[PDB]
């Protein structure tokens, strides 16, 4: 499922990401734009067994188990296929686990390189919450 910017925002806000650890809502929408271009089916193989899954691209060696990655930690105690759904819940819950603080969105290089420092709020302006 490919989300709209406003629809993705509303779902994120409904799940408690708006101002989570002090990160305003636009950060999350901007991260999703760059990580999976708003696509819940997104996937990406890395130069190591690991693959990143879903809307926020969660890694298979550290967060979700894909039962195929060598050295998987499964810190979100969830199967990577769970992260490939149209309901963002499982993805929002693991990301909340990943962002343990006010610097935690660095867990996403795209956010760090393409969002951080820019008017991320431009992504939610004009959206019904």
């Amino acid at each position: 499922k490919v989300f709209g910017r406003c629809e993705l925002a509303a779902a994120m806000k409904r799940h408690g990401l708006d101002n989570y650890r002090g990160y305003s809502l636009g950060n999350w929408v901007c991260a999703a734009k760059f990580e999976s271009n708003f696509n819940t089916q997104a996937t990406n193989r890395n130069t190591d067994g690991s693959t990143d899954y879903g809307i926020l691209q969660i890694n298979s060696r550290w967060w979700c188990n894909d039962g195929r990655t060598p050295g998987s930690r499964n810190l979100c105690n969830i199967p990577c296929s769970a992260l490939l759904s149209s309901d963002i819940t499982a993805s929002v819950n693991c990301a909340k686990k990943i962002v343990s603080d006010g610097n935690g969105m660095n867990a996403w290089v795209a956010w760090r390189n393409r969002c951080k420092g820019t008017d991320v709020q431009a992504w939610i302006r004009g959206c019904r919450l």
Partner: antibody
Amino acid sequence: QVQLQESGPGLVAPSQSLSITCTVSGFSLTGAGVNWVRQPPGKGLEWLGMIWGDGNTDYNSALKSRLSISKDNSKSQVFLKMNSLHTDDTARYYCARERDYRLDYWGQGTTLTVSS
Amino acid sequence: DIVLTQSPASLSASVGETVTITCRASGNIHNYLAWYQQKQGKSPQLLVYYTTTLADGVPSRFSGSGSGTQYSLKINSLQPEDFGSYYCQHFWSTPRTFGGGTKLEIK
């Protein structure tokens, strides 16, 4: 340690063009925006403009045509330039770091006086 | 632009009292509102951001609230070091504007 320090001329005639510098440290200019604010003697805070981490700039509607903000990421300096000076431009000038929609760190300010 | 109307202009209070400063926005700012404290001869200091979030190091006696267009800063059991000026600022799009300031002084 995040630090912001302003440097400026102190006194200027309308016959000149004002430039103030904001040297920062402790953080990168690519990942944070820097705002410019002034406070006239015994007055409140007035927002002048800003430069985003990406280099885009936004300005105060009334002051737009007299202001120009730019920066040098390698020198870690942000600049405010202003022309058509008036006695009303006399104030203390501040640069402040913007981190996700809040000015969390401020410079000490430089005082400017516009002569005759 | 969105203008912010802050009241009251000054407030005289005693230590231990609870006060409230308000800022009303001319347009919906959707919670993008911060509060700053400025003591005599110092530069502004962030207190609260995103309407209710306290800056690190800021004491719990401060709390903000509001939505849409009316926002409040409440100070409970105000202490000697709380005296000074207070300003609100909105961050909804650009240009950003500040409230006119409130001077909190000793009774």
